[model samples]
Target: RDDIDASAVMAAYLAREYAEAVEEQLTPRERDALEALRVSGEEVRSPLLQELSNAGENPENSHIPAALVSALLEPTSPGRMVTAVELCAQMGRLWTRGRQLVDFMRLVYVLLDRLPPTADEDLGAWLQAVARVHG
Candidate 1:
């Protein structure tokens, strides 16, 4: 019982610490995007999304240049960020040139490593997609 209580307390403390760390890293645009996605429950007109769409239209040179993914990963729930990233990856695969798709996948691979082990579902799905692209 005491051990359980201690573990609960530690978890809560770590959650708070992680939130604070993420808060400091978010830009104003990222905060707005996150709030719209997670809190406002409204359509997000994120510049990141717009940029991605534009890139999709020009897939011969598609690029995932924004730090938005990193910001989203840190502050939001894994499921939410996973959905967003998966969509982005899908767009890359569908529209981007092979060279561009591989470039974006490399970035996704880097971000996947940064996520907690609990994000295995998202990571696994992403890796499968990447494997198909490489194959």
Candidate 2:
């Protein structure tokens, strides 16, 4: 029960950080920072994305660490009535999902950036429940 309360505070902290970060739209430079995070594996530094850098280092493009990463890795386009039309449609879909993935990653940035752990706190199943509670 106490652990749940501890996680609650952690999760609340994460939400606040994410919310404040979003209060301001990402600048073009910040966008490029995410691009950097997209590339360098680690050295890529974004204005406000240190956690993304660490998470990105989990590395191995094949090893998707985030659910959003997996969702965007789909077969591209589904229909095949007109391959060109399908490709165009899929491209548009990519834009929407891409935006989602980008901003979603910033939330991820918040998660890893500020998940402060208490040394004596329980690091057990309740932590999993805490994460769900946060989401």
Candidate 3:
């Protein structure tokens, strides 16, 4: 059957591969933001951050950048910090290009990674916290 959705298939593949790489290298915040962006899977358009983090058909389809992967996997490299910073900055842009988005994905990452994983905190509260911090 030649009816396959090539764009979907490619985006899915790239998202998965990128997610893995992102997971390995980026801090929780960066990884989560990038993952959230990829999960949305919408192409770049007006207001790149407008649709960020919105739940869609494939939320699990998140991935990491190759540069992040290189930095994390090879921390001893001369340009590791630069790569990490660049990746984080790119993820920041992806998550919130302006004031509206509020970097919720990054907030989620921070709350999930920083707070006790076993804490019985409400996700909503964490989201609120993100809003407060970002806004």
Candidate 4:
């Protein structure tokens, strides 16, 4: 008998529908990151993460603002990105306040919370801003 975890299966299904529902609300960065993930296979996050994690004096090396955190466990993983959109929607008029992309940036920052830099400081501030404005 191939018993399965119903909840796990349902969650992905639910996650997919939810993502499709508010799909358009995704900010520019999220869309690009999603597109990148869709095209780049599971190795997507490696380069971006490497760039993000590296220490550079310029702090402007990588242009990619949103790193979707990878998709090995993340492939067919609409919820990873989709969930952030829901949070963005519930968090007041994020777009109106120049925060259209903040949620993605902030969530990625949290998920990949490893940096120990000015760019790092910027993400820190952005994370607080996401919470501060949400309330």
Candidate 1 residues 1-135, lDDT tens each?
A: 343445445545765898889989988755644443343223342555556556532434344432555666665564555555554444433434333444566556656755656665654454455446655
Can you write out model 4's per-residue Cα lDDT over 10-128, one digit (the tens) per residue? Answer: 54576589889777797775565555434323333334344443432222322233333333113323334433333323321222223233443454454445322243354335444
Evaluate model 4: give its lDDT. 0.40
Number of the top lDDT candidate = 1
Q: Model 4 reaches what TM-score against the true structure?
A: 0.28
Question: Comparing 3 and 4 by lDDT, which wins?
Answer: 3
- Output the lDDT of residue 109, model 2: 48
Residue-wise lDDT of candidate 2 within 5-33, one digit each (tens)? 45445545775798678747877644543
| TM-scores for the candidates | 0.36, 0.22, 0.25, 0.28
What residue pairs clash in candidate 4, if any at all?
71-74, 71-75
User: The CA-based lDDT of model 1 is what?
Assistant: 0.52
Ranking by TM-score: 1, 4, 3, 2
Please, what are the lDDT tens digits per residue for candidate 3 over residues 51-84? 5435322222233333233334341331232233
**1 versus 3: better lDDT goes to:** 1
Query: What is candidate 2's CA lDDT for residue 20?
Result: 75
Off by over 4 Å in 4: 27-30, 44-135
Q: What pairs collide in candidate 1?
A: none
TM-score, candidate 1, is 0.36
RMSD of each: 19.0, 20.9, 14.9, 17.2
With candidate 3 superimposed using the best TM-score fit, by how many Å does residue 57's alpha carbon deviate from the native?
A: 13
TM-score for predicted model 3 compared with the true structure: 0.25
